Each structure stands twice: as structure tokens, then as C-alpha cells.
């Protein structure tokens, strides 16, 4: 058997990216061998979270009684080479016919990133095949006419950008540097930032697209000569680590660093030697949501051909996996449950049985998905008309001397003061 696939009465696609590789030129039309590339522990954790969720539901005699959920899951280290997995989810018996109005899957969870979603979503949108993303935060996916069957269980970039602005406005500094990943996620972030501060005291004094060619020596030289103290770094794990590691090596000091939620809970950087030297790190963070039972599931899982379904991660420390950045955990959990509930309601399941042999079209799943209204771990799972989530909080953290991301504030989407911060918890310099 395999972690990546599970037979069931109905199938859910899982689109993950367990390995990382930078894009490169290719001269053949074929999938990429991701199993040989850089392993990513927290993405792998999120992958397990989906496996955990499905098994939890299959264990339940209440949700989907006597109806098993299976999955086909993928490790797409490359968005441009992800299409074989995507085709498999949409095919009738390993065949696609383009002009069709019984697909292998009833919906899909993922993908994690905006680049992955932009590359493949039109193929799902055409037949209103439902996608529930646990990570994609692009502004553009809130345009329902462009992405009619796209939903997500994390907030749009606009909300995180608002929280970041609230962090800046709580303090006295008004010149800001904005370092962003040279990708769709990063560019959209810069755009929202620029839009949000235009009518405020905040001045964007410097900004730069981050990639492998960044002259960090020169970037930090300029930042220093403009006497800029606040540096927003809006970037995924790989880019954020490049920035902060370069900052340590170039003896950047006395800065105030502000992280987006994709690296405020990073687990490598708070323990890196010298991290202290570059100043103070704050960030917007997803609060830690405890998923009961997950710990036991991981211990159990670690104790254990189609492309992009191979982990090559034998002999992982169970400890390291448990302790990995837990951001996006509830987004994954809630995404699986939303599809489960949608299926349950589409089948017209009662409290202890389901009408059987019923053929389900993905578009029927969609209608129930958009009408989602259920409780999960004392949160209420709903989506607005744009497919954006109406659940999930944002907090402010401070990386404190023992290496923890200590909560020091809460971001309120509605409140008169949008951002509270207990400033005495923050130990500067």
C-alpha cells in the first residue's frame, strides 16, 4: 500500500508539495522526479493532516455512515509538471474527453500555493469541480466569476497585510522596507501593502523582489543608508530563510523584522546561531490550533507506480515531525471536513445510514460546499460568497529569548481597534 492513495466509496484529491525545487528548463514533456529533491518537513506534516482527517471521518459512524472516503494524493514539487496528477483526478478510467458536460474524484483539497493554483485551477473551474485550498492566499481567487468552484480555508493576502499594517501603526516607525518573494504570492502581497498604506503615515522607503540572485550585501547596504529600521519580509519558507540567514551573515543589526504567517512560526530560524544579532522579530501568526489525536496518528504513521506519489523520507524523527511548524493544520483539517459534510449532505445521509450506490457529480458537492455551516473543534466552518473563510484567527507574535513565538497580540477583523498589542511582553534590541 501507500500513504498517497486509499480506496474508498468516494475519492478526494490531495495536492501537496512535500519536496522543493526551483524551476528549471526542460526539453521533454514528462513529470518531474520530486522524491530526489529537498524534503520539506512542515508540508509533510500538512500532508499527514489530510490523511489523519480522512481516517477520522472513516472512523465515524455519524458523518458519512458506512461510506468510506478514499484519496489520491500528490507531491507536486513543480506546478508546471503537476498536470499528470490533475488529469488523474478528473479522468473517467484514465481518459479525459474535453467536451464533456462520473469523474474519479468528487473534489480536491489543495494546493498549498498560489502558483500551483493559478496553473491548474481553470481546468477544475470549467466543470465546476470543487477545490478547497488550505494555503492559497492570492487576492485574485476572491473573484468568484474567475474562480467559481474555488474555496479556501485560509484568509486572503489582504487580511494578513491589514494585520501587518496594524503592527506597524501600533509603534512609532514609519519608513518601511518590504522584502517579498519573487512570485505570485509575494507580488500580490506587495500590491496589497502598497494599496493599504497609500493613505497613511507609513512610507514604503524600499522594496525588493527576493530570489536566488538577490545581492543581499547590496540590499542591506541600501536599507542601512536609508536608516530604515522596519523590514517586512512577506515570503514562503525558502525565501524567508534566505533573507534572515543572509542578514545574520552580513551583520545586520537593530532592525525590527515583521513576518507574515508563513514564517512567523518557522522552526529553523529562531534556533539558528546569531539570530539574536539582527534585532527583534515580530509577525502575524495563525494561533496554534490543537488537533486532538494527531500526535497518536503521527507516531503510528512514522512507524511504517504513478508519478509524484513517493516520499523517500524513511527514518524521519517522529519528534521533528511533531514539532514542525503547525500553521495551516486546521485549514487542512477543515478543508477535508467541508468536503466530507458536502458529500454527506449531497447523499442525503441520515444520522446512521446513507442512500447507497448514488452517483455523485462534483458540481453537486460545490453547492453544499458553498452553503457550509457546521462546527468543528468549537469553530464554525462557513465560507462567504467569494469562497473565503469566515473562521480562523490571526495573532501577533514576538520571538522571545527561549526561542518561542510568544503571542503578544490579537488581530480583530471587525473591532474598532483592529490590532491589540501588549507591548511590555516585547523585549527589544
Amino acid at each position, epitope marked *: 500500500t501507500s500513504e498517497f492513495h486509499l480506496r474508498g466509496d468516494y475519492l478526494i484529491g490531495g495536492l501537496f508539495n512535500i519536496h522543493y525545487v526551483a524551476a528549471a528548463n526542460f526539453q521533454r514533456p514528462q513529470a518531474i522526479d520530486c522524491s530526489s529533491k529537498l524534503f520539506i518537513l512542515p508540508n509533510y506534516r500538512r500532508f499527514q493532516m489530510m490523511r489523519f482527517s480522512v481516517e477520522e471521518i472513516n472512523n465515524s459512524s455519524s458523518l458519512l455512515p458506512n461510506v468510506s472516503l478514499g484519496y489520491q494524493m500528490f507531491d507536486h514539487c513543480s506546478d508546471i509538471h503537476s498536470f499528470p496528477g490533475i488529469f488523474k483526478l478528473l479522468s473517467v478510467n484514465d481518459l479525459i474527453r474535453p467536451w464533456e458536460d462520473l469523474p474519479n474524484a468528487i473534489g480536491v483539497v489543495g494546493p498549498f500555493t498560489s502558483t500551483h493554483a493559478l496553473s491548474i485551477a481553470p481546468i477544475f473551474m470549467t466543470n465546476l469541480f470543487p477545490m478547497v485550498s488550505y494555503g492559497c492566499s492570492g487576492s485574485v481567487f476572491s473573484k468568484e466569476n474567475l474562480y467559481p468552484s474555488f474555496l479556501r480555508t485560509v484568509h486572503s493576502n489582504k487580511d494578513v497585510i491589514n494585520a501587518i499594517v*496594524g503592527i506597524i*501603526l*501600533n509603534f*512609532n*516607525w*514609519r*519608513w518601511v522596507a518590504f522584502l517579498y518573494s519573487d512570485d505570485d504570492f509575494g507580488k500580490d502581497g506587495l500590491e496589497q501593502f502598497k494599496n493599504k498604506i497609500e*493613505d*497613511s*503615515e*507609513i*512610507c514604503l*522607503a524600499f522594496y525588493k523582489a527576493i530570489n536566488v540572485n538577490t545581492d543581499y550585501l547590496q540590499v542591506f547596504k541600501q536599507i542601512e*543608508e*536609508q*536608516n*530604515i*529600521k522596519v523590514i517586512v519580509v512577506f515570503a514562503p519558507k525558502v525565501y524567508a530563510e534566505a533573507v534572515v540567514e543572509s542578514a545574520v551573515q552580513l551583520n545586520v543589526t537593530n532592525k525590527v523584522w515583521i513576518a507574515d504567517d508563513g514564517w512567523s512560526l518557522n522552526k529553523k530560524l529562531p534556533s539558528m546561531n546569531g539570530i539574536q544579532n539582527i534585532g527583534t522579530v515580530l509577525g502575524v501568526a495563525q494561533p496554534v490550533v490543537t488537533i486532538p489525536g494527531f500526535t497518536d496518528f503521527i507516531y503510528s504513521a512514522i512507524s511504517q507506480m504513478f508519478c509524484n506519489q513517493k516520499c523517500n523520507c524513511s527514518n524521519l524523527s517522529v519528534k521533528s515531525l511533531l514539532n514542525a511548524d503547525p500553521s495551516f493544520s486546521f485549514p487542512v483539517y477543515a478543508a477535508v471536513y467541508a468536503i466530507a459534510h458536502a458529500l454527506h449532505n449531497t447523499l442525503r445521509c441520515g444520522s446512521d445510514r446513507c442512500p447507497k450506490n448514488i452517483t455523485v457529480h462534483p458540481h453537486m458537492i460545490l453547492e453544499e460546499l458553498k452553503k457550509s455551516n457546521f462546527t468543528l473543534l468549537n469553530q464554525t466552518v462557513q465560507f462567504d460568497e467569494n469562497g473565503d473563510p469566515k473562521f480562523g484567527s490571526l495573532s501577533v507574535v514576538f520571538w522571545n529569548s527561549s526561542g518561542n513565538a510568544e503571542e503578544v497580540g490579537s488581530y480583530h477583523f471587525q473591532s*474598532s*481597534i*483592529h*490590532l*491589540s498589542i501588549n507591548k511590555t511582553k516585547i523585549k527589544w534590541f
Partner: antibody, heavy 124, light 112 residues
Framework: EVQLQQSGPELVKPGASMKISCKAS????????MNWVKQSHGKNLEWIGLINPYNGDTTYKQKFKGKATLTVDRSSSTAYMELLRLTSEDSAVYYC?????????????????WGQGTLVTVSA | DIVLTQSPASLAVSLGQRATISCRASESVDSYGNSFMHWYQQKPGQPPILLIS???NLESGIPARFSGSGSRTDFTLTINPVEADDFATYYCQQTNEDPRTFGGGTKLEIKR
């Protein structure tokens, strides 16, 4: 365009308190500090303090601590300054004034927009 | 607290001629690569108007006959040529350091 519109002149009793309003329009209210300035008839300008309308944080010049109280009402985009325990030396023209854009800190911002001024006469 | 001293206290300058107004600070008002000294015009009964920020930056809408110069502790506002509506009190203001302080002002008179 930006307008700062202050409440009208006010005759107030010695020992009493009074509240000046500064109604801000034409821009995003919580984005900029609102300053207050005192001008005695001698004509010196004196900075009283500022308020961050985003979170309510205040900074005062020492001599106005416990003498002036800056607040904001975010739902009406109005900044308020309350003057306590009025004496004839509180007789003056009082201005609200918005911080501009381009300074490196809230502290260094200059004043680009001014209310029209509020004349306070402390007399029995 | 930074003390700003303006000179002269009062000034009479003919139309078409140049007015020069000094402001001296007790301590440097430089930081962040800038000089945080600003100049304001105040006509009687009117709010002050910002003419020049950061020693030399002419504000939008302000006529080009107004210019500023200087650094550290010594600053100059220049009005050239002076015109008939330029009579006012001119104030300097430092914002380098809490609390913000103003100069006692310079009253410019039109000579005729």
C-alpha cells in the same frame, strides 16, 4: 480633499473643563497622528501632544500631562481634546493638526493640515 | 527640550526684494539623514501654513519664491522676491525630538 473642522469659540468658567472637537474628513482617519497646538495671544506656538487614532496611544509635552486629555472617536472621525481645571492662562487659540507623510517616525512628522482654530476664553 | 531662536524678531523688506530669516537650534536637529526643521507662514487670525519641510523641501502648492536651507543647528528661510501678501509671522519648528518646539517667530513687514 482633507479638512479639519474644529468646534466653535467657547467662553468657559475658571475651574471648569471643556472639550474641543476636530472633525476630520477626506482621508483615512486612523492612518495619521492628530496633533494639538496652543497659541497664546503672545503668539508663541506650543505643541500639546498627539494621539494615534488607530489605537489611542498618546504622547504629551510634559507641562500638559494631566492638563489636556486627547481622545478620538473612530466611528465619527473626530479627534477631541479636553482641557481640565481651566485658568485664564488656558485662554488661547487651540489648533488640531494632522501629521503628514514622509517622516521616518511618528515623532518627526511635520504638520500639513490644520483645523481653523478654536478660541477659548476662560472667564467668569 | 530643544530651544529655537529666530533672528531677526521683525523685518521690513520692500516689494521685489529678498527677505532672509534665520533660525538657530540649541542642539542638532539632524537624524535619519535629514534635518527636521520646518518653516510655517501664519497670517493673523489664520492657521499656520507649512511652507518648507526638512530644511529645503518646498511643499506642494507653495510658490517657488519661498526656499529653505541649512543643517544641524542653523537654518535659513528665504523669500525672493517678496510680494505684497507675504506679510506674516514666520515660524520654524523642529521635529527631531519630543517635544516638538517652535521658534518665537519672525514678523515680516512689507516696506513701502
Amino acid at each position: 480633499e482633507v479638512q479639519l473642522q474644529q468646534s466653535g469659540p467657547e467662553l468657559v468658567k475658571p475651574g471648569a473643563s471643556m472639550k474641543i472637537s476636530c472633525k476630520a474628513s477626506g482621508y483615512s482617519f486612523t492612518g495619521y497622528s492628530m496633533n494639538w497646538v496652543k497659541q497664546s495671544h503672545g503668539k508663541n506656538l506650543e505643541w500639546i501632544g498627539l494621539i494615534n487614532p488607530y489605537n489611542g496611544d498618546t504622547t504629551y509635552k510634559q507641562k500638559f500631562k494631566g492638563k489636556a486629555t486627547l481622545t478620538v472617536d473612530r466611528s465619527s472621525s473626530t479627534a477631541y481634546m479636553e482641557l481640565l481645571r481651566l485658568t485664564s492662562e488656558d485662554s488661547a487659540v487651540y489648533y488640531c493638526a494632522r501629521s503628514g507623510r514622509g517622516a521616518p517616525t511618528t515623532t518627526t512628522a511635520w504638520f500639513t493640515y490644520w483645523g481653523q482654530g478654536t478660541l477659548v476664553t476662560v472667564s467668569a | 527640550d530643544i530651544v529655537l531662536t529666530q533672528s531677526p524678531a521683525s523685518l521690513a523688506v520692500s516689494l521685489g526684494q529678498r527677505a532672509t530669516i534665520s533660525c538657530r537650534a540649541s542642539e542638532s536637529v539632524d537624524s535619519y539623514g535629514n534635518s527636521f526643521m520646518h518653516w510655517y507662514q501664519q497670517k493673523p487670525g489664520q492657521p499656520p501654513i507649512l511652507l518648507i519641510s526638512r530644511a529645503s523641501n518646498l511643499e506642494s502648492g507653495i510658490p517657488a519664491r519661498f526656499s529653505g536651507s541649512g543643517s544641524r543647528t542653523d537654518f535659513t528661510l528665504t523669500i525672493n522676491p517678496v510680494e505684497a501678501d507675504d506679510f506674516a509671522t514666520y515660524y520654524c519648528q523642529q521635529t527631531n525630538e519630543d517635544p516638538r518646539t517652535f521658534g518665537g517667530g519672525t514678523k515680516l513687514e512689507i516696506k513701502r
